[PDB]
Amino acid sequence: GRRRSVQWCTVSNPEATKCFQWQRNMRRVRGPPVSCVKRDSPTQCIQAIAENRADAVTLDGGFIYEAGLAPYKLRPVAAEVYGTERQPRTHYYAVAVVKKGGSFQLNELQGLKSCHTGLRRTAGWNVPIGTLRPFLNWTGPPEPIEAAVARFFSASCVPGADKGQFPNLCRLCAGTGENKCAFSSQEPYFSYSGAFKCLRDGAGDVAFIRESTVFEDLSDEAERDEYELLCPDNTRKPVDKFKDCHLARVPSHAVVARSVNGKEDAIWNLLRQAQEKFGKDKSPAFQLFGSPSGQKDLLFKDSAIGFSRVPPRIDSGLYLGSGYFTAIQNLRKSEEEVAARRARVVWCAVGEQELRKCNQWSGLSEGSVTCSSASTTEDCIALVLKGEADAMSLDGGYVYTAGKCGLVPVLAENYKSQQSSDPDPNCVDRPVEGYLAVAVVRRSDTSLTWNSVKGKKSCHTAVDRTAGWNIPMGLLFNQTGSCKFDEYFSQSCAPGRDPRSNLCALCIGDEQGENKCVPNSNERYYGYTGAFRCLAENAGDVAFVKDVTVLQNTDGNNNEAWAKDLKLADFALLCLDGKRKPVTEARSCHLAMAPNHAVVSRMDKVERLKQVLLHQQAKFGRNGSDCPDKFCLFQSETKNLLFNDNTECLARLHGKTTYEKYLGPQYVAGITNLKKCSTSPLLEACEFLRK
Ligand SMILES: *[C@@H]1O[C@H](CO)[C@@H](O[C@@H]2O[C@H](CO)[C@@H](O)[C@H](O)[C@H]2NC(C)=O)[C@H](O)[C@H]1NC(C)=O
Ligand SMILES: *[C@@H]1O[C@H](CO)[C@@H](O[C@@H]2O[C@H](CO)[C@@H](O)[C@H](O)[C@H]2NC(C)=O)[C@H](O)[C@H]1NC(C)=O
Ligand SMILES: [Fe+3]
Ligand SMILES: [Fe+3]
């Protein structure tokens, strides 16, 4: 009984009214049902929703943040759309509006009077206070940040502030008696228009609102030129140049619901129908995005032009963006705590084995490196977007996904280069050469060739990895044209695939026999080493790995049980011409050349990450002073934990600073094509956040 009715939570009485009208028009055109619940605040609606007593509520970014925390854990499911039909946007601008006449700039606001939309709201609080922080002389956490704002502005109106504790922040508010400084429309200086009115009336000298307000409340183009914008470059510009004069670019308000049983489908269904039937100029009888004369923004932003569905993988953190998300958090931290986080590198480990090795490295980094972890690589990418993690080394296939999500390459894993050979002094500056993706089979299976590989059993490092997937499948796909990847081979072990699929049939999970097909080291057949093992133990007939994998795991080079006796001569490669050669002849018998694995991070961490890694590798690197004695980064004994064990050093990119330039035009084209057959939820999430 999920769609019976969607229960919208209102925060005020006039809002309740509108919610009721909407209820009847939905019952007058025979659309999905909607019922209304009352409360007196966002927080209450947030609680109402988590306690199964309501289904949805529209919130500003600031409360999207609160709603995603601990008890509640709600998620955005639908964003508001603004702009025009020709150029829609699911974001808006936080600006600072002043009157034409004064001469003061953004850095000269000390002692002036301010007008805010409400405490903890995006444009009215979070952004302006985050931006002015260097001028506040705030000492940190015991002392609330409000207190410091109270001394900076001689007087303000900050709806919802504790007027008993911060009287200065309620001074200019126009509410009557108990409605003075109330977080509701009872306070006339509340929200975007309220804060703007506070400016027009001359009560305050500056207003912190959004870019559209001045245009929504002032019809006469003439009255608009009496106002200007404060730009962060300490200049003033017309209110129409907000694209070039804003404090921040922020995500649009969004409808939230619970993560578990939210009734997302029901919510989305109601909205879409509501939007079609009552959107901008659809029916005079009702305006979903319109509000009564003396009222503003009831249930939704007036003049919003529709909704855009938010992808499933997105949670509150991802929605807000790394900048804004971590900016909120920093408002509750001291400048020393913030600068310390800025100085440290948080690594993401994929799996307990990687976390273990990571912890060991951390305990020896003199405070420069710490750890975090997830069970998949994609989940680790998400933590880097949320700022909970900063870096990790990825196969080229994941560098694609990471790039489409806005991350960038910093350094690459350099491997024992072609015999220019000798422990290279300038390894860090030696251009990368990529590696060789090959197809490996047992020497005895004499009939097996590239032309007859289809239909047999296959072993892959993991889905979406270069040598293990993108290259093999890409070649096959280029022939048939089928998107049915699970029919290319009878059975396989392709970690990260659907467990009940054939692509998981040969996988064997951990020693206990659990985690079958999981994309991390617990699956014994995972990665370069795991896919080889899959072949050597006779599970599959061909393994898609790199040439050095076979070398590093035969002739006693790996003294583990399954591999102790394997010999290099018991294996051969399948060449694209139908022939077969020994592993030692991979330069003339490979499927393609793959880009070196690379370390990725957010743009704001590149410099710091780089100096740390360079330092760390000089200590624990290949010729690391303290390598054998204490710790070696590039060693883990064929498990390839955190980095490939054959990494000589982490080297510079020489200008290839974007994933497109680093991966190359051909390889990117290749993956893009493969992606038409299916995309990951993460890839879907990032397409949405980049729009
Ligand atoms: C914030 O800190 C500044 C300096 O730390 C204080 O500013 C002073 O700057 C003005 C302009 O020259 C002078 O009136 C004072 O003499 C300065 N400090 C000194 C030497 O006393 C500012 O008053 C502080 N703002 C607060 C606490 O809100
Ligand atoms: C599969 O790969 C081949 C190899 O590049 C692609 O090659 C070309 O297609 C064009 C159009 O027919 C020819 O003019 C070129 O001569 C071909 N290239 C080569 C190197 O011979 C082919 O287009 C690929 N894609 C698919 C899906 O067919
Ligand atoms: Fe807002
Ligand atoms: Fe790889």
Q: Give the 3-state secondary structure of 464-503.
A: CCHHHHHHHHHHHHHHHCCCCHHHCCCEEECCCCCCCCHH
**Domain layout of the chain by residue ranges:** 1-91+251-339, 92-250, 340-434+595-691, 435-594
Question: How do 345-350 and 369-374 pair as beta strands?
Answer: parallel
Residue closest by Cα to atom 2 of ligand 1: 137
In angstroms, the Cα distances linking 452 to 155, 460, 461, 534 are 80, 18, 21, 19
Strands 592-594 and 542-546 turn out to be unpaired
Structure method: X-ray
What is the rounded distance in angstroms from the CA atom of residue 408 to the CA atom of residue 653?
A: 11
Distance 528 CA to ligand 4 centre (A): 8
151 CB near ligand 1 (under 6 Å): yes
Which H/E stretch holds residue 115?
A: strand 113-116
Q: In whole angstroms, give the CA distance from residue 342 to residue 32.
A: 49
Cα distance between residue 271 and residue 671, in whole Å: 35
Residue 406 marked as a ligand binder:
no
Kindly write down the DSSP assignment for every residue of 536-589, as one continuous string. HTTS-SEEEEEHHHHHHTSTTSS-STTTTT--GGGEEEE-TTS-EEEGGGGGGS
Q: Say how far apart CA 341 and CA 333 lie, in whole Å.
A: 11
* Burial zone of 136 (CB within 10 Å; 0-12 exposed, 13-18 middle, 19+ buried): middle
Give the integer Cα–Cα distance in Å for 431 and 411: 11
Contacts of 446 (CB under 8 A, 6+ apart): none
Whether 436 contacts 593, CB under 8 Å: yes
Distances (CA, A) of 67 to 268, 323, 324: 19, 18, 15
d(CA 193, CA 171): 18
115: nearest Cα among 157, 55, 73, 67: 157
Segment holding 611, helix H or strand E: helix 606-620
DSSP structure class, residue 234: S
Q: How long a stretch of residues is the chain? A: 691
Distance CA 310, CA 312 (A): 7
Ligand 1 close to Cβ of residue 152 (< 6 A): yes
Architecture of the domain delimited by 340-434+595-691:
3-Layer(aba) Sandwich (3.40)
Cα–Cα distance for residue pair 77/256, rounded to 1 Å: 6
11-49: burial string, b at 16+ Cβ within 10 Å, e else: bbebbbebbeebbebbeeeebbebebbbbeebbbbbbbb
Phi then psi dihedrals of residue 667, to 5 deg: -65, -40
User: Is 217 annotated as belonging to a binding site?
Assistant: no
The answer to whether the beta carbons of residues 257 and 77 sit under 8 Å apart is yes
Using a CB cutoff of 5 Å, list residues around ligand 4, an ion: 395, 466
Known binding residue 123? Answer is yes
Are 119 and 183 in contact by the 8 Å Cβ rule? The answer is: yes
- Which are the contacts of 101, defined by CB distance < 8 A and separation ≥ 6? none
The β-bridge partners of 601 are: 408
What whole-number distance in Å separates Cα of residue 345 and Cα of residue 340?
Answer: 10
| CA pseudo-torsion sign 663, 666, 669, 673 | negative
92-250: CATH class: alpha beta
Which residues have a Cβ under 8 Å from the Cβ of 420 and sit 6 or more positions away?
430
134 Cβ closer than 6 Å to some ligand 1 atom: no
How far apart are the CA of 121 and the centre of ligand 1, in A?
29
CB of 137 sitting under 6 A from ligand 1: yes
Is residue 73 annotated as a catalytic residue, yes or no?
Answer: yes
Ligand nearest 109 Cα, by number? 1
Please check whether the two domains, 1-91+251-339 and 435-594, share a CATH topology.
Answer: yes
CA distances from 323 to 114, 128, 130, 250, 599 (A): 25, 14, 11, 9, 21
CB of 153 shorter than 6 A to ligand 1: no
Whether residue 138 has its Cβ less than 6 Å from ligand 1: no
User: Could you identify the residue written with the tokens 């750890």?
Assistant: 371
Best residue for ligand 1 mutational test, from 114, 137, 143, 152 (most atoms within 8 Å of Cβ): 137
- d(C-alpha 65, C-alpha 327), whole Å: 11
- Rounded to the nearest angstrom, the distance between the alpha carbon of 300 and the centre of ligand 2 is 52
Q: Which residues contact 136 (CB under 8 A, 6 or more apart)?
A: 145, 148, 149, 152
Which DSSP letter does residue 664 get?
-
Q: How far is the CA of 117 from the centre of ligand 3 (A)?
A: 8
CATH 3.40.190.10 fits 1-91+251-339, yes or no: yes
Choices 2.60.120.10, 3.40.190.10, 3.30.420.40, 3.40.50.1970: CATH for 435-594: 3.40.190.10
Tokens read off for 90? 């699911």
Q: Is 395 annotated as a binding residue?
A: yes
Strand-pair partners of 238: 228
280/547 Cα distance (integer angstroms): 61
3-state class of 401 per DSSP?
helix
DSSP string, 272-308: HHHHHHHSTTS-TT--TT---TT---SSS-TT--EEE
Helix (H) or strand (E) segment spanning residue 373: strand 369-374
Tell the burial category of 379 from Cβ atoms under 10 Å away from its Cβ (0-12, 13-18, 19+). Answer: middle
Instruction: Count CA atoms within 13 Å of residue 425 on its CB side.
Output: 0
DSSP state of 631: -
